[PDB]
Amino acid sequence: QRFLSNHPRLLFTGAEEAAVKQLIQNNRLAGELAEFLKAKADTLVITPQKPYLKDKYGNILWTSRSYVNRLGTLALAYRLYGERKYLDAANEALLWVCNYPDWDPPHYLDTAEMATAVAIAYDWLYDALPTSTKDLVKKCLYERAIVRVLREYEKGSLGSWAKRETNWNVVCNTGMVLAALGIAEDYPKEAAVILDNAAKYMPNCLKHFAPDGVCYEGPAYWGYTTSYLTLYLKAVADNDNGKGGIAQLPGLERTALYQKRTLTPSGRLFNFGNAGADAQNSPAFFLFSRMYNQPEVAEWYREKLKLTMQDNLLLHQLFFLSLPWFDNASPKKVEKIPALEIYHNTINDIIVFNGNRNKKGSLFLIAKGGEPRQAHQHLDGGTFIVESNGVCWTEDLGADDYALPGFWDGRPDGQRWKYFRNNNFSHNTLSIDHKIQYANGEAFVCEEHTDAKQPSVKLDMTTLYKDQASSVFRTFKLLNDYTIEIMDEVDLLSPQSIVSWIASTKAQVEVKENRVRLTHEGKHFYMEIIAPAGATFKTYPAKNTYKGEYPIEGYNMLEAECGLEGGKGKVVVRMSSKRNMR
Ligand SMILES: [Mg+2]
Ligand SMILES: [Mg+2]
């Protein structure tokens, strides 16, 4: 029988309740989280139902997501505390959304998330709801979810929301699996068919996590994909013996680690292209930490939970699962974050350096390859963010305004690259003869030495400088806990060409000959150009140029304009939290 015999069988089982109640009693953070979620439930009890109302885009997705949060939080509070105001509020919400004319299947994410919300509450309140509500909910799940997805599996093309390569596949198949399992005792044959088709089609999306767990589309996209993926993984682990092998797909084991490990210690996101912080507190992290035995991720997510509660941050629609999924594990003292690791991806390789995290002033550095012709990308191959003492000493200026004239004209001669934020002049990489990178090139990791005493990695950037250089290689080397060396090897096509080493910063800048001192809130960082001999740093403010740009304020640029003997040589810059890098 391919489901647990009794409700609740979805995400937080009956058998799991005893241990969760003990955590709430015995673990302060879990206890604080329980009280926090109970208080959220308290206001949800007295919050109006949402009218069926499409947004400017023609869908109700925001409303479905609202009900995921409302129904999950209310039903959790009823299971943990037994106060019938939580049950009755969930009953009212269930009847309300079942009396919607539809769950807007023309934009099927709407149906996927509404079915998820409804299935969870139905399952979690099964013995505690009026029979008339259970009858109506079962019929709505059957007609609006199970019947539709069975048709979609049989008739849908590869472009179908159940089969395409985008995260719609994961979200929709997940919502359908949860709906099917929620009413499985009444539709067991349908639930088995849906389980098998979900496992068949979901790899069309999830194969793109291979090999190392990188989500090219960025953290918001990752957060939506994996919040629903973890519901699926947990549900089929609990109900179907893990059949279908989704959990073992290459890259999935490492994907939460990627998200945690690519933040600076102070929490700053590598905001390249149009990436931005919005996905923070999805409970997916606790499923990954438990299923793949990564206490490092659990410990990091608990810190995020504390901050979410302390600063009253916005909640992921599935945030309520953080409590039943609570993972109290921590890494052992002996376990260390590697000094250097690389996350390979077909579009942009990601490089991550860590000096000894237990030594104050040690360096964190993250850098990227990339393909600038891809959507939303910048001419930023080789750029890096370095952090020490809680300060990001180099920057990424983020995306500019999507409304700008020619913002999408991404051809090599296109208007997109005239904007500072889009081109390499704002990024921490090379400009030859004060020109932009070639938009149709790429930078990628071509050599790695992650186990050396001074670990290093080499990027091939040649094709980003196609008309200017016959080869361009950038090597990052961690010389010690406090010091990174960047070696650019450039074979110029013209021996008089100038190689500009550029970096952006929000720190105060003092330059003198081949040295830079950066200052921020009394903390310092240092840079020294050691090759070619006699090179000089200058500095100047970044500024706006074209009307309609997001304001560019508080950014300073560093630039070393370097000639190379015979047009062939090296630019070598050492960077350290200590002034002496001899
Ligand atoms: Mg950028
Ligand atoms: Mg590669």
Side-chain angles (χ1 to χ4, degrees), residues 37-55 57-64:
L37 282 170
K38 192 185 192 303
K40 294 300 191 175
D42 284 332
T43 298
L44 288 165
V45 164
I46 59 183
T47 289
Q49 305 306 326
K50 310 305 203 186
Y52 182 109
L53 174 62
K54 298 183 176 172
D55 60 15
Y57 302 116
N59 65 63
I60 63 162
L61 188 46
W62 181 93
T63 297
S64 301

PDB file of all heavy atoms in Angstrom, residues 37-64, unseen atoms left out:
ATOM      1  N   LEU A  37       4.973  30.875  16.001  1.00  0.00           N
ATOM      2  CA  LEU A  37       3.996  30.373  15.041  1.00  0.00           C
ATOM      3  C   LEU A  37       2.590  30.352  15.625  1.00  0.00           C
ATOM      4  O   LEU A  37       1.616  30.572  14.902  1.00  0.00           O
ATOM      5  CB  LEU A  37       4.420  28.989  14.570  1.00  0.00           C
ATOM      6  CG  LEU A  37       5.537  29.035  13.529  1.00  0.00           C
ATOM      7  CD1 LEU A  37       6.053  27.641  13.317  1.00  0.00           C
ATOM      8  CD2 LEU A  37       5.002  29.617  12.229  1.00  0.00           C
ATOM      9  N   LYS A  38       2.466  30.100  16.930  1.00  0.00           N
ATOM     10  CA  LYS A  38       1.161  30.170  17.576  1.00  0.00           C
ATOM     11  C   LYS A  38       0.598  31.585  17.502  1.00  0.00           C
ATOM     12  O   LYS A  38      -0.608  31.775  17.284  1.00  0.00           O
ATOM     13  CB  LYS A  38       1.280  29.733  19.032  1.00  0.00           C
ATOM     14  CG  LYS A  38      -0.050  29.479  19.730  1.00  0.00           C
ATOM     15  CD  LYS A  38       0.218  29.169  21.209  1.00  0.00           C
ATOM     16  CE  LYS A  38      -0.986  28.614  21.922  1.00  0.00           C
ATOM     17  NZ  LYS A  38      -2.150  29.505  21.858  1.00  0.00           N
ATOM     18  N   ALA A  39       1.462  32.587  17.692  1.00  0.00           N
ATOM     19  CA  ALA A  39       1.016  33.976  17.619  1.00  0.00           C
ATOM     20  C   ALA A  39       0.588  34.338  16.204  1.00  0.00           C
ATOM     21  O   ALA A  39      -0.405  35.054  16.017  1.00  0.00           O
ATOM     22  CB  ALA A  39       2.119  34.913  18.108  1.00  0.00           C
ATOM     23  N   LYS A  40       1.322  33.856  15.191  1.00  0.00           N
ATOM     24  CA  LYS A  40       0.875  34.036  13.814  1.00  0.00           C
ATOM     25  C   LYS A  40      -0.507  33.433  13.613  1.00  0.00           C
ATOM     26  O   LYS A  40      -1.387  34.059  13.007  1.00  0.00           O
ATOM     27  CB  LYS A  40       1.873  33.413  12.838  1.00  0.00           C
ATOM     28  CG  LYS A  40       3.233  34.107  12.809  1.00  0.00           C
ATOM     29  CD  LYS A  40       3.094  35.576  12.397  1.00  0.00           C
ATOM     30  CE  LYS A  40       4.458  36.181  12.115  1.00  0.00           C
ATOM     31  NZ  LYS A  40       4.365  37.575  11.591  1.00  0.00           N
ATOM     32  N   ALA A  41      -0.724  32.225  14.142  1.00  0.00           N
ATOM     33  CA  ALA A  41      -2.029  31.593  14.045  1.00  0.00           C
ATOM     34  C   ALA A  41      -3.105  32.432  14.731  1.00  0.00           C
ATOM     35  O   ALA A  41      -4.235  32.541  14.232  1.00  0.00           O
ATOM     36  CB  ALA A  41      -1.957  30.194  14.661  1.00  0.00           C
ATOM     37  N   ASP A  42      -2.767  33.027  15.876  1.00  0.00           N
ATOM     38  CA  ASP A  42      -3.735  33.838  16.617  1.00  0.00           C
ATOM     39  C   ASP A  42      -4.283  34.971  15.756  1.00  0.00           C
ATOM     40  O   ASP A  42      -5.491  35.222  15.751  1.00  0.00           O
ATOM     41  CB  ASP A  42      -3.100  34.405  17.886  1.00  0.00           C
ATOM     42  CG  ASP A  42      -2.959  33.376  18.982  1.00  0.00           C
ATOM     43  OD1 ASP A  42      -3.768  32.425  19.023  1.00  0.00           O
ATOM     44  OD2 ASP A  42      -2.028  33.529  19.798  1.00  0.00           O
ATOM     45  N   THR A  43      -3.420  35.653  15.004  1.00  0.00           N
ATOM     46  CA  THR A  43      -3.950  36.714  14.149  1.00  0.00           C
ATOM     47  C   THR A  43      -4.629  36.156  12.902  1.00  0.00           C
ATOM     48  O   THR A  43      -5.631  36.724  12.451  1.00  0.00           O
ATOM     49  CB  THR A  43      -2.851  37.709  13.808  1.00  0.00           C
ATOM     50  OG1 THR A  43      -2.399  38.306  15.031  1.00  0.00           O
ATOM     51  CG2 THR A  43      -3.376  38.814  12.890  1.00  0.00           C
ATOM     52  N   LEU A  44      -4.159  35.020  12.373  1.00  0.00           N
ATOM     53  CA  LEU A  44      -4.858  34.418  11.238  1.00  0.00           C
ATOM     54  C   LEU A  44      -6.299  34.061  11.572  1.00  0.00           C
ATOM     55  O   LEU A  44      -7.174  34.114  10.688  1.00  0.00           O
ATOM     56  CB  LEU A  44      -4.106  33.165  10.747  1.00  0.00           C
ATOM     57  CG  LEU A  44      -2.789  33.462  10.017  1.00  0.00           C
ATOM     58  CD1 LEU A  44      -1.936  32.194   9.908  1.00  0.00           C
ATOM     59  CD2 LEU A  44      -3.024  34.077   8.627  1.00  0.00           C
ATOM     60  N   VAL A  45      -6.570  33.679  12.825  1.00  0.00           N
ATOM     61  CA  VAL A  45      -7.932  33.323  13.217  1.00  0.00           C
ATOM     62  C   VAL A  45      -8.883  34.467  12.918  1.00  0.00           C
ATOM     63  O   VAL A  45     -10.027  34.251  12.492  1.00  0.00           O
ATOM     64  CB  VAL A  45      -7.983  32.930  14.703  1.00  0.00           C
ATOM     65  CG1 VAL A  45      -9.430  32.951  15.227  1.00  0.00           C
ATOM     66  CG2 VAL A  45      -7.338  31.550  14.922  1.00  0.00           C
ATOM     67  N   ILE A  46      -8.420  35.698  13.095  1.00  0.00           N
ATOM     68  CA  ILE A  46      -9.306  36.857  12.995  1.00  0.00           C
ATOM     69  C   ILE A  46      -9.041  37.671  11.731  1.00  0.00           C
ATOM     70  O   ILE A  46      -9.455  38.829  11.644  1.00  0.00           O
ATOM     71  CB  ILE A  46      -9.206  37.726  14.259  1.00  0.00           C
ATOM     72  CG1 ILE A  46      -7.773  38.199  14.473  1.00  0.00           C
ATOM     73  CG2 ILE A  46      -9.684  36.943  15.459  1.00  0.00           C
ATOM     74  CD1 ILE A  46      -7.592  39.014  15.771  1.00  0.00           C
ATOM     75  N   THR A  47      -8.371  37.079  10.736  1.00  0.00           N
ATOM     76  CA  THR A  47      -8.024  37.667   9.439  1.00  0.00           C
ATOM     77  C   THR A  47      -9.068  37.306   8.381  1.00  0.00           C
ATOM     78  O   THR A  47      -9.430  36.132   8.252  1.00  0.00           O
ATOM     79  CB  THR A  47      -6.643  37.167   8.999  1.00  0.00           C
ATOM     80  OG1 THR A  47      -5.636  37.756   9.829  1.00  0.00           O
ATOM     81  CG2 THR A  47      -6.358  37.540   7.565  1.00  0.00           C
ATOM     82  N   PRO A  48      -9.583  38.260   7.607  1.00  0.00           N
ATOM     83  CA  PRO A  48     -10.591  37.924   6.583  1.00  0.00           C
ATOM     84  C   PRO A  48     -10.102  36.918   5.542  1.00  0.00           C
ATOM     85  O   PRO A  48      -8.926  36.888   5.167  1.00  0.00           O
ATOM     86  CB  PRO A  48     -10.881  39.277   5.914  1.00  0.00           C
ATOM     87  CG  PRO A  48     -10.528  40.293   6.936  1.00  0.00           C
ATOM     88  CD  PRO A  48      -9.327  39.709   7.674  1.00  0.00           C
ATOM     89  N   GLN A  49     -11.036  36.101   5.055  1.00  0.00           N
ATOM     90  CA  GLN A  49     -10.791  35.320   3.843  1.00  0.00           C
ATOM     91  C   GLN A  49     -10.500  36.252   2.671  1.00  0.00           C
ATOM     92  O   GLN A  49     -10.993  37.384   2.615  1.00  0.00           O
ATOM     93  CB  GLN A  49     -12.004  34.449   3.507  1.00  0.00           C
ATOM     94  CG  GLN A  49     -12.454  33.525   4.639  1.00  0.00           C
ATOM     95  CD  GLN A  49     -11.322  32.654   5.168  1.00  0.00           C
ATOM     96  OE1 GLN A  49     -10.430  32.233   4.423  1.00  0.00           O
ATOM     97  NE2 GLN A  49     -11.345  32.396   6.468  1.00  0.00           N
ATOM     98  N   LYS A  50      -9.687  35.763   1.726  1.00  0.00           N
ATOM     99  CA  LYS A  50      -9.366  36.502   0.502  1.00  0.00           C
ATOM    100  C   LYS A  50     -10.442  36.284  -0.558  1.00  0.00           C
ATOM    101  O   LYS A  50     -10.803  35.140  -0.843  1.00  0.00           O
ATOM    102  CB  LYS A  50      -8.016  36.062  -0.076  1.00  0.00           C
ATOM    103  CG  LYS A  50      -6.834  36.031   0.902  1.00  0.00           C
ATOM    104  CD  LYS A  50      -6.639  37.353   1.589  1.00  0.00           C
ATOM    105  CE  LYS A  50      -5.209  37.501   2.095  1.00  0.00           C
ATOM    106  NZ  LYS A  50      -5.031  38.742   2.894  1.00  0.00           N
ATOM    107  N   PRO A  51     -10.959  37.337  -1.178  1.00  0.00           N
ATOM    108  CA  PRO A  51     -11.893  37.127  -2.283  1.00  0.00           C
ATOM    109  C   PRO A  51     -11.146  36.563  -3.484  1.00  0.00           C
ATOM    110  O   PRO A  51      -9.935  36.755  -3.645  1.00  0.00           O
ATOM    111  CB  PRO A  51     -12.450  38.532  -2.559  1.00  0.00           C
ATOM    112  CG  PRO A  51     -11.352  39.461  -2.109  1.00  0.00           C
ATOM    113  CD  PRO A  51     -10.694  38.764  -0.922  1.00  0.00           C
ATOM    114  N   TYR A  52     -11.862  35.804  -4.300  1.00  0.00           N
ATOM    115  CA  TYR A  52     -11.283  35.349  -5.562  1.00  0.00           C
ATOM    116  C   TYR A  52     -11.086  36.575  -6.444  1.00  0.00           C
ATOM    117  O   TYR A  52     -12.059  37.223  -6.832  1.00  0.00           O
ATOM    118  CB  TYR A  52     -12.192  34.317  -6.220  1.00  0.00           C
ATOM    119  CG  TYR A  52     -11.678  33.730  -7.528  1.00  0.00           C
ATOM    120  CD1 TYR A  52     -11.229  32.417  -7.593  1.00  0.00           C
ATOM    121  CD2 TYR A  52     -11.659  34.484  -8.700  1.00  0.00           C
ATOM    122  CE1 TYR A  52     -10.758  31.873  -8.786  1.00  0.00           C
ATOM    123  CE2 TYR A  52     -11.190  33.951  -9.895  1.00  0.00           C
ATOM    124  CZ  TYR A  52     -10.749  32.644  -9.933  1.00  0.00           C
ATOM    125  OH  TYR A  52     -10.291  32.116 -11.125  1.00  0.00           O
ATOM    126  N   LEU A  53      -9.833  36.906  -6.740  1.00  0.00           N
ATOM    127  CA  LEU A  53      -9.513  38.174  -7.397  1.00  0.00           C
ATOM    128  C   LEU A  53      -8.175  38.042  -8.110  1.00  0.00           C
ATOM    129  O   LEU A  53      -7.139  37.914  -7.453  1.00  0.00           O
ATOM    130  CB  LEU A  53      -9.477  39.303  -6.376  1.00  0.00           C
ATOM    131  CG  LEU A  53      -9.018  40.679  -6.872  1.00  0.00           C
ATOM    132  CD1 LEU A  53      -9.944  41.224  -7.943  1.00  0.00           C
ATOM    133  CD2 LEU A  53      -8.912  41.663  -5.699  1.00  0.00           C
ATOM    134  N   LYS A  54      -8.195  38.087  -9.439  1.00  0.00           N
ATOM    135  CA  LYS A  54      -6.962  37.982 -10.202  1.00  0.00           C
ATOM    136  C   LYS A  54      -6.178  39.292 -10.135  1.00  0.00           C
ATOM    137  O   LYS A  54      -6.750  40.383 -10.035  1.00  0.00           O
ATOM    138  CB  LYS A  54      -7.271  37.630 -11.655  1.00  0.00           C
ATOM    139  CG  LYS A  54      -7.968  36.298 -11.834  1.00  0.00           C
ATOM    140  CD  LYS A  54      -8.185  35.977 -13.305  1.00  0.00           C
ATOM    141  CE  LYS A  54      -8.789  34.593 -13.488  1.00  0.00           C
ATOM    142  NZ  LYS A  54      -9.175  34.350 -14.907  1.00  0.00           N
ATOM    143  N   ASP A  55      -4.854  39.170 -10.175  1.00  0.00           N
ATOM    144  CA  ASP A  55      -3.960  40.317 -10.171  1.00  0.00           C
ATOM    145  C   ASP A  55      -3.782  40.865 -11.592  1.00  0.00           C
ATOM    146  O   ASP A  55      -4.425  40.412 -12.544  1.00  0.00           O
ATOM    147  CB  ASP A  55      -2.626  39.938  -9.533  1.00  0.00           C
ATOM    148  CG  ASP A  55      -1.921  38.822 -10.278  1.00  0.00           C
ATOM    149  OD1 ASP A  55      -2.303  38.524 -11.434  1.00  0.00           O
ATOM    150  OD2 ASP A  55      -1.025  38.194  -9.677  1.00  0.00           O
ATOM    151  N   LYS A  56      -2.900  41.866 -11.740  1.00  0.00           N
ATOM    152  CA  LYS A  56      -2.677  42.502 -13.036  1.00  0.00           C
ATOM    153  C   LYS A  56      -2.216  41.509 -14.086  1.00  0.00           C
ATOM    154  O   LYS A  56      -2.367  41.773 -15.285  1.00  0.00           O
ATOM    155  CB  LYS A  56      -1.631  43.616 -12.923  1.00  0.00           C
ATOM    156  CG  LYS A  56      -0.613  43.411 -11.818  1.00  0.00           C
ATOM    157  N   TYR A  57      -1.651  40.382 -13.660  1.00  0.00           N
ATOM    158  CA  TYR A  57      -1.151  39.351 -14.551  1.00  0.00           C
ATOM    159  C   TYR A  57      -2.203  38.308 -14.894  1.00  0.00           C
ATOM    160  O   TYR A  57      -1.940  37.442 -15.734  1.00  0.00           O
ATOM    161  CB  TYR A  57       0.066  38.687 -13.913  1.00  0.00           C
ATOM    162  CG  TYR A  57       1.151  39.692 -13.606  1.00  0.00           C
ATOM    163  CD1 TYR A  57       1.540  39.950 -12.295  1.00  0.00           C
ATOM    164  CD2 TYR A  57       1.753  40.426 -14.631  1.00  0.00           C
ATOM    165  CE1 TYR A  57       2.524  40.886 -12.013  1.00  0.00           C
ATOM    166  CE2 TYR A  57       2.735  41.359 -14.361  1.00  0.00           C
ATOM    167  CZ  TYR A  57       3.117  41.588 -13.052  1.00  0.00           C
ATOM    168  OH  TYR A  57       4.095  42.522 -12.783  1.00  0.00           O
ATOM    169  N   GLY A  58      -3.379  38.374 -14.273  1.00  0.00           N
ATOM    170  CA  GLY A  58      -4.462  37.469 -14.594  1.00  0.00           C
ATOM    171  C   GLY A  58      -4.498  36.180 -13.804  1.00  0.00           C
ATOM    172  O   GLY A  58      -5.168  35.237 -14.232  1.00  0.00           O
ATOM    173  N   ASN A  59      -3.817  36.102 -12.660  1.00  0.00           N
ATOM    174  CA  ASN A  59      -3.841  34.878 -11.864  1.00  0.00           C
ATOM    175  C   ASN A  59      -4.058  35.204 -10.387  1.00  0.00           C
ATOM    176  O   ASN A  59      -4.025  36.369  -9.967  1.00  0.00           O
ATOM    177  CB  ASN A  59      -2.564  34.052 -12.073  1.00  0.00           C
ATOM    178  CG  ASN A  59      -1.318  34.742 -11.563  1.00  0.00           C
ATOM    179  OD1 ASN A  59      -1.172  35.016 -10.361  1.00  0.00           O
ATOM    180  ND2 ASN A  59      -0.393  35.022 -12.484  1.00  0.00           N
ATOM    181  N   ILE A  60      -4.287  34.148  -9.602  1.00  0.00           N
ATOM    182  CA  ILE A  60      -4.527  34.266  -8.167  1.00  0.00           C
ATOM    183  C   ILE A  60      -3.376  33.671  -7.355  1.00  0.00           C
ATOM    184  O   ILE A  60      -3.564  33.325  -6.194  1.00  0.00           O
ATOM    185  CB  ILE A  60      -5.866  33.627  -7.748  1.00  0.00           C
ATOM    186  CG1 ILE A  60      -5.877  32.122  -8.021  1.00  0.00           C
ATOM    187  CG2 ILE A  60      -7.064  34.323  -8.427  1.00  0.00           C
ATOM    188  CD1 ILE A  60      -6.968  31.375  -7.252  1.00  0.00           C
ATOM    189  N   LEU A  61      -2.177  33.570  -7.941  1.00  0.00           N
ATOM    190  CA  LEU A  61      -1.069  32.880  -7.277  1.00  0.00           C
ATOM    191  C   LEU A  61      -0.783  33.452  -5.893  1.00  0.00           C
ATOM    192  O   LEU A  61      -0.496  32.699  -4.955  1.00  0.00           O
ATOM    193  CB  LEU A  61       0.197  32.950  -8.134  1.00  0.00           C
ATOM    194  CG  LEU A  61       1.378  32.107  -7.637  1.00  0.00           C
ATOM    195  CD1 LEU A  61       0.958  30.681  -7.244  1.00  0.00           C
ATOM    196  CD2 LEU A  61       2.484  32.071  -8.691  1.00  0.00           C
ATOM    197  N   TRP A  62      -0.832  34.780  -5.752  1.00  0.00           N
ATOM    198  CA  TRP A  62      -0.601  35.385  -4.445  1.00  0.00           C
ATOM    199  C   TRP A  62      -1.645  34.919  -3.442  1.00  0.00           C
ATOM    200  O   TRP A  62      -1.349  34.783  -2.249  1.00  0.00           O
ATOM    201  CB  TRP A  62      -0.620  36.910  -4.569  1.00  0.00           C
ATOM    202  CG  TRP A  62      -0.368  37.635  -3.274  1.00  0.00           C
ATOM    203  CD1 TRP A  62       0.840  38.072  -2.795  1.00  0.00           C
ATOM    204  CD2 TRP A  62      -1.345  38.001  -2.288  1.00  0.00           C
ATOM    205  NE1 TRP A  62       0.669  38.692  -1.576  1.00  0.00           N
ATOM    206  CE2 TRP A  62      -0.659  38.659  -1.241  1.00  0.00           C
ATOM    207  CE3 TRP A  62      -2.733  37.839  -2.189  1.00  0.00           C
ATOM    208  CZ2 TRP A  62      -1.313  39.150  -0.111  1.00  0.00           C
ATOM    209  CZ3 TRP A  62      -3.381  38.328  -1.061  1.00  0.00           C
ATOM    210  CH2 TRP A  62      -2.669  38.978  -0.040  1.00  0.00           C
ATOM    211  N   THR A  63      -2.874  34.676  -3.908  1.00  0.00           N
ATOM    212  CA  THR A  63      -3.918  34.209  -3.007  1.00  0.00           C
ATOM    213  C   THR A  63      -3.693  32.751  -2.611  1.00  0.00           C
ATOM    214  O   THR A  63      -3.822  32.390  -1.433  1.00  0.00           O
ATOM    215  CB  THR A  63      -5.282  34.392  -3.667  1.00  0.00           C
ATOM    216  OG1 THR A  63      -5.502  35.791  -3.887  1.00  0.00           O
ATOM    217  CG2 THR A  63      -6.376  33.837  -2.780  1.00  0.00           C
ATOM    218  N   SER A  64      -3.365  31.898  -3.576  1.00  0.00           N
ATOM    219  CA  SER A  64      -3.044  30.515  -3.229  1.00  0.00           C
ATOM    220  C   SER A  64      -1.907  30.456  -2.222  1.00  0.00           C
ATOM    221  O   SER A  64      -1.973  29.701  -1.243  1.00  0.00           O
ATOM    222  CB  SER A  64      -2.688  29.717  -4.478  1.00  0.00           C
ATOM    223  OG  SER A  64      -3.773  29.731  -5.382  1.00  0.00           O
TER     224      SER A  64
END
